[PDB]
Amino acid sequence: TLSAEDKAAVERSKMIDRNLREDGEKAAREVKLLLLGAGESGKNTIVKQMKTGIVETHFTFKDLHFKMFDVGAQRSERKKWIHCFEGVTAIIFCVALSDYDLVLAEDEEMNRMHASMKLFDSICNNKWFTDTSIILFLNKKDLFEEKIKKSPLTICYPEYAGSNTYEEAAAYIQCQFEDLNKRKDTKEIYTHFTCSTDTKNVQFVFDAVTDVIIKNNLKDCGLF
Template sequence: MNCFAGLCSSQDEQDASQKNMAINKDLKRYRKSFENQLRLLLLGAGESGKSTIVKQMRVIYSTGFSTKEREQMKKPIYSNICNSIKTMIEFIEQADIPLEDSQLIEDTEWMTNNVAEDGSVTAENSEFFDRAERLWHSDVIQEAYRRANEYQLLDSTKYFFDDIERIRKLDYLPSDQDMLQARIITTGIFETKFIVKGATFHMFDVGGQRSERRKWIQCFADVTGIIYIVATSAYNQYLREDTSQNRLVESLELFTSIWKNRWLSQVSVVLFLNKCDLLKEKIEVSDMGDYFDDYDGGCDYENAKGFIRSKFLAIGIATETRRLYPHFTIATDTANIKRVFTDVKDIILHFHLAEFGLV
């Protein structure tokens, strides 16, 4: 009987060993599956640079942009240029900035009367480009550009106008940088898939305007991590949808609501303090202290960066299961985003595996 019991015991041990091996095999496969499927949600206020980050992922980790996509982007780029020049002309009129040159008067009147709101021009519209280029180099338009924080002007304005000779050519095909600089308002939810060192990322870009934010909740399920994007250069600007609300204040308030959201309480957050190149230009001529009473760093770029960073860190207080990881970024700088995203991938992956006890 004891021998029979021993045989049973041996058989039980063998069965247990096989089950254990099967469990370990499943766990290994489970771990590999989770390691290789990462869902990232891009959040932030409008015009913070979310869509540019998505485009960078395609440039860095995927096949980039096809010739067809570049051709299709020509119209939005021309529209951006039209929008910028018309917006600056409208500001000149509203601010009562005098046009003393008869040629400038003629050019502004022509733009007002002949350029549609949708900016439907092509490279064949040589008269438009002649007048736009002449206006851009005028003192009055340059003054309007310097005062861009007083109204709504695209961040890409200077980039496109400084290179308008190339853009207006009949054989023009947008470069990678043109594609990154082009502004198209995001409405709805867009998914981009790409692979980084064996890990598959599903990145979701959601419109940041207030009217779009109600759609965010649809993306919260099974989120691996959040990248929250802030336009640091927007400290002296106001929302398109609410001209009484400072854009940086809006970003801080929005971040507070995300950090405190109970559905996201276990989700790691990476903070992209974006548009640092524009911040560096602005801080030299526009004192942040005029917009934030607790700022006393003057026109120093590093002081300005540190101040904005501290504002968000004060909200995103670390817990046992969650931390905020800030990075200073320039979304249009491919090398910068590639370097930063290498760190982001490691951070997100670590927390993702830790959530399931796999590290």
């Protein structure tokens, strides 16, 4: 029913279909991570440890290929393209602990730490990331300890009844972000304390991703 050239064109289409299938299988094995965080939050320092539009970082760690997407350079409306990342394995959110007492440069009246809270709450409770786990990096821990002695958390948190010790101050900030999670059953938040001299930040992502992968398989089978 087909001519000689029609049959050859169908065979070419079959070869294209085979190549599309192979590329899709390779893509599905990779781990996609959405890298978020406000400016001057140590996000750039994280990329170096992991070794004008969207920046993609590729790295391999323990036979797992990671694709990390940085979207901080984009200044357009977030809601018009945030749905493009629906389906990533996890979201990496960077928060600078040393910015609790700082004030946002543009606003000049908004606390820098409170700026990350509204960004975290929007991403965590976003409809496109209902079942997406979040990896939270609390950076500048060494600098945060220095600022705690001079400036207490009362400036950032007026309704704070805790002490000014390093352990108590850091723990309170971590609980503040995890409380923003309005869906504590569908998604989980993994919090890690990072520093410029730390070398275990890649291991934490691998451990958190491995935990996400295991729970994804259990949820797919209907066990959860």
